[PDB]
Amino acid sequence: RSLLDQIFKPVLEDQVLDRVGAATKKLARFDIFVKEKSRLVFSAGTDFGNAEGSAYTNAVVRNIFGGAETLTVNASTGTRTRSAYNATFSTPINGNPDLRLSVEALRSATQKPWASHEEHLTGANLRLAWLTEKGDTHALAYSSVWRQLTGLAPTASPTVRADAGDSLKSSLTHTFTRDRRDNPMLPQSGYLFRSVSELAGWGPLNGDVSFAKTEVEASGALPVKSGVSVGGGLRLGVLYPLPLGYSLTGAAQPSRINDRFQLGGPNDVRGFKIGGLGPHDGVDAVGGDVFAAGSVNALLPLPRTGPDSPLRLQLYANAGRLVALNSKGTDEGLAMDSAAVFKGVKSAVGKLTNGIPSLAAGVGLVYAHPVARFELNFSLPLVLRRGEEGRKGLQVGVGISFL
Amino acid sequence: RSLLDQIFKPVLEDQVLDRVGAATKKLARFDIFVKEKSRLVFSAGTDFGNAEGSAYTNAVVRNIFGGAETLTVNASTGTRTRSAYNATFSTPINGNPDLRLSVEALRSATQKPWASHEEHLTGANLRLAWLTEKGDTHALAYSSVWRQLTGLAPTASPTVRADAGDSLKSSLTHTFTRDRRDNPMLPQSGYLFRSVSELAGWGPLNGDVSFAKTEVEASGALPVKSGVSVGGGLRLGVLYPLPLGYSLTGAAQPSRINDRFQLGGPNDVRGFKIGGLGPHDGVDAVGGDVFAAGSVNALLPLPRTGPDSPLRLQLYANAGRLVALNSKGTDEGLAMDSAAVFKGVKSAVGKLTNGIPSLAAGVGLVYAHPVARFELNFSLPLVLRRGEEGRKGLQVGVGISFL
Amino acid sequence: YFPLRIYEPNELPERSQQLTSGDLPTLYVFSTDSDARLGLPSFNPGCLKWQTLLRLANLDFRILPSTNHSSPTGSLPFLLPPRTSPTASPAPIPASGLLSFGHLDADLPPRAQAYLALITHSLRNAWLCALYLDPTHDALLRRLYVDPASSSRAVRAALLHQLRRAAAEQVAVYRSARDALDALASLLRESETAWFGTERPGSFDAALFSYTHLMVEYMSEETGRVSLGRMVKEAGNGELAEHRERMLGVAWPEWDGYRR
Amino acid sequence: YFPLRIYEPNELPERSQQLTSGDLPTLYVFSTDSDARLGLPSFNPGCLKWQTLLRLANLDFRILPSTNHSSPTGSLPFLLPPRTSPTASPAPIPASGLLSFGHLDADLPPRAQAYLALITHSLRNAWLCALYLDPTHDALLRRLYVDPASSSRAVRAALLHQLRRAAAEQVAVYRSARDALDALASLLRESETAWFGTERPGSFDAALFSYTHLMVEYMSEETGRVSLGRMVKEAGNGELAEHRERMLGVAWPEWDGYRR
């Protein structure tokens, strides 16, 4: 009762005034809906009968003490070890549904075809999903994971054969969002902004890897109700190695293939293979440290029809430049002092400025579904750095984040 | 062991001779595959948490004693009573996988929108799926069902408000097939033939309803490798009432709405609503007793491409005439003696001859998938009897049986 | 736009040609086809009420047995207007609108409003128990609600059970019905207008005739717990008995066959 | 057809620039980076075998520690050819093809074929038990297989267990190893050619050096059940001890540091 009393009293304490709409939004934020939302759910798609049991499972618990929630998934297939831990938890914190908290203990096998290997995560994390009143979101995290690489089946590389061990990566991120977008899937006249800056191993945050990854974003839109809706886009990113103990100068072990940016595909830069635009090694796509991006868009509305059902046109011209961090300086297995790595990135960013990076181009057919965004484009990569695996056919794009 | 020994010995008892291919086909017919087919399967898509449990279920058992099989389905939704009996059974008979047998105890709610009501079957049957060696199939059945009508929600009719009781209908069918078709979904140069003649209530076959429904079929194809593939089609049908006790002359109660043919839809006669071409009552589609059908087809192959992937064109001109059985003769609630009903159908077939029945026409885009057949036609009904609910847009057709 | 010809809608089948065409409105009730031809009263009281009402309103019609699934609502006794277009029919009339299709449904003093709750809520129960629960009357329920349903002993046991269960929960009680018929007997001995206060019998006399009659015809079997067939004729000085006979001289002034 | 320009492939990152570029073929073995610079022998016998083989074949190369996931097959000791194109590399060579990349792998009399099954199937087990199972040696297994793996006590307990379990099932046995080293000691006392029948040591001497050496260096801890470090030097008249020293004067004729 007090859960709602604490928000009723600020309304009750005061021609006529309409301050109750904010209370209604507060109520709706709890994901507990005034009739009901639901109670628990379930499923067990339990196959059987052979060397595989396939042991499906699911669960939701939409309340425990009044506002706390849980979840669970599983697939004890009998071929994969398990995904038996994908359980979560949620609870507001001392009064409001904004300052959420959470705990998860994930375990999965994130298969990667573009780099011919696999990953075996067995970690757990802890979030704090504070949503500021104006729409600006925040977050935190602390995700000690295990991050094993064991899928080197075909001829992969002599690079992805140097990264097959393990790691801890006790990270601590900090998300952000300033979403003024008019339609989350179809940016027509809105806005955007993000930041995902995490500090992986340093001082108290222990483990083995050590860096500070700093990914930024931007967006735009400007219809000059003719849905002309000129587009936009921009991204950035930096992967700066760091020492391991409570300092800023000293040893610094360079990046692995688990922590580097990969820039390409139907979701980030249209007109390239799912992983392209990188310091490629033969056939295998090794990621680079520093990178940038870009885009321009048109999103023409179907003429002689009007601002009807979401479907529109699209005329994009992407970009992208994912360099890697070389040293080529002061020539000890892997130990670069702060002076060297600094003069590495400082020079490994000059390669970003010079040169026409890359330029896809084409047309597409957007279908701004409420929950997703289907693209089905067709593009033609103009400029390329040798061995980046351009693509030219039908560029089937599906997801939530695009450029 | 003897299961295979009895078919090995006729091969072992005899340049070189190749009589083993027939043995391989016999082995393959068992649906037991030399490595394996499978063992049991399962699922329980069990929702929960509200006034509905939705209680999904499934099961397969691909062997018990060596060749016998079973099945089960269920949905104890908590809104529908249940579908909790949809269980089957299978077993070869004294030596071969041809002379199959079976038992099922179905229970379902076959909803019917075109006639605004529902059906509640709770019956059980018994098959004998003899497959003759040449490809000609046979069958039998004995399906005492319950067949209740209880869905008269909206304004339905004063016709479907005269058929709301119950029935038994202890039928006994006899299927058939002479399938020479080259591709089961895409008839290009093959053939076909069928017959579904059942005797519902008479003599030993007890119950309440009494008739003898006799549905025939035909087909054709003739490519004049240019896949021109001229089409064909034809059907028939007769619903002849019969007395109830061990005789051929006497009482005869006329047809109900549960036992009458309905001729229309994207699967039987393209170019009409899912139920059309009948003795319509206002908005509700009451079926008729005697009927016929027809079709002609083109199935043009995509020019300048060749006999490539199954997709082809289609140019059809259907037909159809589903009369009902009136008496208008010798004018006792519902009791027509054999003399009258005979002179009814004998005259209720003259209405079939006279008059241009109906003629749909259009184009389509066939996609002869291995398991199904997608149509997505577009038709334009030329001739009509008033109030048959023609249709003109996109005629989306999916299924296995078409014209 | 394109359909080229129009060809004389296709002559509805023989069943509906014979049953639901008619000329007069065909009221649906619970009855046996033997009585359908003669317009005799139903055997379910919740429908005999409306039937007696209509036939008091001097409206003519034809009764026609049905099965309680064929109804716009759950309850059966709905009336259908005649057929005006051989392929399209009017809408049904539920039980609430028959007497819309004066003095019958008129406001009564609260006393007359009171006793009606007695009949609707007490006499109704004694009917269910004496019919749907008492095993001695497992014979008469058979000949009425299951025997003309499907006529296959594998089925009859299902419906016969579906009724008894869905009727047992809706309701020992024999005493509450005993004194109730002595109450109404007093309400009649003080009217002196051959009815319950009014010169022309209204909705109350018809609501009571709905039970005073059936319990006489189908429950007068003598074999303790004297059947309700005698209570109705013995309550007071038999003023409930004579009321029906004075009632069954207006609704059906030309039919004999009452009194078992 | 359209891509307009071509712009000098993009300079592989610092890790692969430092590790896997090389000039000579970089054999992967189990080792600690302290020994990698000095080319000292591995600590896993199933790889020291191939390493001793190659260095007998007078082929030069650089050892480079790895982690047994990075391998074309499950087993580790695979060799990589040098880098010929800074963006494209040759294919790996598994353990089966190193000596393809004469007298080493030559047919021997069946007697010499027999005793080799002793070493592969009996001495191998006594190694696992004395290392992966005996709790007194939970210290040395730590400093070798888990300590340079991830360096986080939350993780080390996982790998340390994953090994012991997956190694326990692959195998008391101490006696079977005792007499086995007296068997080979007799096979040596009858050769008189400083090796097991041949003037230049072949695949058998290297297969035995794979175990006679490690058990001396890492298992000579004196604290019953005398450790295998003494059995190797005490079997017979110490002919297994001197064999290694006569062997460790050809493969690595310039290194000192043996004998604990």
Residue numbers in the entry:
A (entry chain B), B (entry chain D): 59 to 72, 82 to 100, 132 to 322, 330 to 436, 441 to 512
C (entry chain C), D (entry chain A): 26 to 126, 143 to 212, 238 to 262, 264 to 289, 292, 297 to 333
Excerpt from the paper describing this PDB structure:
The SAM complex facilitates outer membrane β-barrel precursor protein folding and insertion into the outer membrane. The SAM complex consists of one copy each of Sam50, which spans the mitochondrial outer membrane, and Sam35 and Sam37, which sit on the cytosolic side of the membrane. Sam50 forms a 16-stranded β-barrel which is minimally closed between strands β1 and β16. The structures of Sam35 and Sam37 reveal that they each adopt a GST-like fold, which is also completely different from the BAM lipoproteins.
3D reconstructions for the SAM complex in GDN showed a mixture of monomers and three predominant dimer conformations. Among the dimer conformations, substantial differences were observed for the Sam50 β-barrel. However, in dimers 2 and 3, the β-barrel is open, allowing for association of strands β1 in an antiparallel arrangement, extending the β-sheet across two Sam50 β-barrels. A morph of Sam50 structures from dimers 1 and 3 shows how strands β1–β4 undergo an approximate 45° rotation, opening the β-barrel between strands β1 and β16 to create space for precursor protein to bind. In this morph between our observed conformations, strands β5–β16 remain mostly fixed, as does loop L6 and the conserved (V/I)RG(F/Y) motif. In Sam50, the barrel diameter by the POTRA domain stays constant while the upper ¾ region of strands β1–β4 can flip outward. All of the dimers appear to be non-physiological, with an up-down association of SAM complexes not anticipated from functional studies. Our structures illustrate how Sam50 can open sufficiently at the lateral gate to accommodate precursor binding at strand β1, positioning L6 at the lateral gate through its interaction(s) with strand β16.
